């Protein structure tokens, strides 16, 4: 019975029951891990065996972090997270540091266990049940539930916020120059110091934490070639918005005109000061595409004009923290991908392009998920909320490997879409 601190009550949104989601197949390598980290968590008594009598369930899977080489359990609590929210959002949410984005270096600490020391409301436990498959279905499902705040459930950080704010009072007053944000199982810390000086302050916060029970993972730094550990820090500056740009030809065939009209038309929805008549007139009658139309001096007037319009801050775009977040991703070409994050259609708050990880093994699946993660990360830092994704891929294909490449404590909300090259619009060049 872990702690004599009082249990805070939680009740799911009205007229909604707990999560009744099935367990997806799991690979040995993982089952084996998930079995251990599960066995040992039950002894410490943070978890409890349970049987058929509990009508709920959620999926678990584990990811061998490339960050620390130590498997991490992962429970997909999205449905539950969803069914419980008057709670963690409206009632007792955790505020956002406007300036966390405005730093040059920021690191994320996996303060998961920090949660394993606070009792979860008895009555609410049934809802966090999960099951463990067995290869070739050798034995039935071995299933448990939580007795203490679970890792990766919108509610934990919400509850543990009282104790998590305290733990930091000292560090925050002994280093006011640093910023600290907590989104679910993670702690976002960013400084303006030299990198070497940052790394330190981090490694120092790790200690201060330790001076309190909060044990944080042991990230490794290898000395052989790809010094991957060199990127563990995030830099909210090489973070540049990606505006649309209109080509630059010397002479324009018909074809090349039409396309450039579309783009200009599509983009007309974003920025309104985009006129096309004076430039479409040049295509007045049924003519072979291949025909070199000479640009009028009344025409080339707006081409070079509207373009000037495609390089500034959109139409008074405001972020409303009380509305969801959406993100689209278009597979551009040979490793490139682009995204846009908006709350309202055609009123994006951000637009950019995730380049590529040289070790992308020429895998779209891999790169896509990575983009998701990457894109997700930016969200949390910038607005402190995860966006719903519109993934450019087939549900049944993504659902088959997104795990294999996943390396994060959270999981965003997504859906699939087959929406072809609308207009090279979300720009390729």
């Amino acid at each position, epitope marked *: 019975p872990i702690s004599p601190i009082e249990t805070v009550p939680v009740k799911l949104k009205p007229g909604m029951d707990g999560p009744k989601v099935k367990q997806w197949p799991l690979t040995e390598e993982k089952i084996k891990a998930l079995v251990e980290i599960c066995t040992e968590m039950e002894k410490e008594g943070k978890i409890s065996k349970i049987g058929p009598e509990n009508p709920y369930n959620t999926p678990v899977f584990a990811i061998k972090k490339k960050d620390s080489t130590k498997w991490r359990k992962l429970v997909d609590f999205r449905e539950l997270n969803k069914r419980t929210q008057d709670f963690w959002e409206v009632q007792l949410g955790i505020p956002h540091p406007a300036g966390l984005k405005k730093k040059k270096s920021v690191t994320v600490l996996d303060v998961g266990d920090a949660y394993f020391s606070v009792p979860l409301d008895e009555d609410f436990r049934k809802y966090t049940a999960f099951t463990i498959p067995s290869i070739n279905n050798e034995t039935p499902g071995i299933r448990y539930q939580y007795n203490v705040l679970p890792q990766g459930w919108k509610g934990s950080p919400a509850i543990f916020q009282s104790s998590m704010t305290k733990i930091l009072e000292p560090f925050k007053k002994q280093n006011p120059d640093i910023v600290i944000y907590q989104y679910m199982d993670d702690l976002y810390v960013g400084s303006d110091l030299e*990198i*070497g000086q940052h*790394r*330190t302050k981090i490694e120092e916060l790790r200690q201060h934490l330790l001076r309190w029970g909060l044990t944080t993972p042991d990230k490794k*730094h290898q*000395k*052989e*070639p*790809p*010094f*991957l550990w*060199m*990127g563990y820090e995030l830099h909210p500056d090489k973070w540049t918005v990606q505006p649309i740009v209109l080509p630059e030809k010397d002479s324009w065939t018909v074809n090349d005109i039409q396309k450039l009209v579309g783009k200009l038309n599509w983009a007309s929805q974003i920025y309104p000061g985009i006129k096309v008549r004076q430039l479409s007139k040049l295509l007045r009658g049924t003519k072979a595409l291949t025909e070199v139309i000479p640009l009028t001096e009344e025409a080339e007037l707006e081409l070079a004009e509207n373009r000037e319009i495609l390089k500034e801050p959109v139409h008074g775009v405001y972020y409303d923290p009380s509305k969801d977040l959406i993100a689209e991703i278009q597979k551009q070409g040979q490793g490139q991908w682009t995204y846009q994050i908006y709350q309202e259609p055609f009123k994006n708050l951000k637009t950019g392009k995730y380049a590529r990880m040289r070790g992308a093994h020429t895998n779209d699946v891999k790169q896509l998920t990575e983009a998701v993660q990457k894109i997700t990360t930016e969200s949390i830092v910038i607005w402190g909320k995860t966006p719903k994704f519109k993934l450019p891929i087939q549900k049944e294909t993504w659902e088959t490997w997104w795990t294999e490449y996943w390396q994060a404590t959270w999981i965003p909300e997504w859906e699939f879409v087959n929406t072809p090259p609308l207009v090279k619009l979300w720009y390729q060049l």
Partner: antibody
Amino acid sequence: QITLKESGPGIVQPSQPFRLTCTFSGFSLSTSGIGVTWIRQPSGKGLEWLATIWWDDDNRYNPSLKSRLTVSKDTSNNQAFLNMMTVETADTAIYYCAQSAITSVTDSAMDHWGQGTSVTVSS
Amino acid sequence: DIQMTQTTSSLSASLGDRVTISCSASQDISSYLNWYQQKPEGTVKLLIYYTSSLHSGVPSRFSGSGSGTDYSLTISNLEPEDIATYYCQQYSKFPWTFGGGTKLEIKR
């Protein structure tokens, strides 16, 4: 504004040990990338890598000699050490200690060198 | 034990010339080669890191090239110091290793 200087015994009797000391200023052996490398260079022949003590104490040795090597560091005094056991004539050489450092995701080089010490084995 | 080999041992040249030295590896070292200059005295300095990046304070007349297993160092137009012994070190896998070095001399 960075420099290292190897300190030594200059001359060692056979089958005895020697302890080279690198004393540096300009960088800490506490800062991430940093580390110190011990190079060697026998009479007339070319450079040889010997060991690199890193800030995380994740030291790496030249397999041919690990059995007679050891690295240490008095981080507070900016000193770095190298010990060799049971030396033989072939150990007679010039030893360098350099300030190896890992700048970024792909760059890891021995930015600055010492001048070396003359260690020779003779009875 | 990633053998590093500079075939050319003793090469002689003359002021104003342009020279190239080769550092052949023993496996795809994926551009983790470094070049070192050791003057007649003995002091050793860092020319190029990451096979083609000039260490701060090095004369532009210095260039690095290489890929997979074959790599080259090229000195624009010789000055009277350049004439010295040269080394390339690999760091794709400990143990680290240096070439056999190439002594750059003077044609008389």
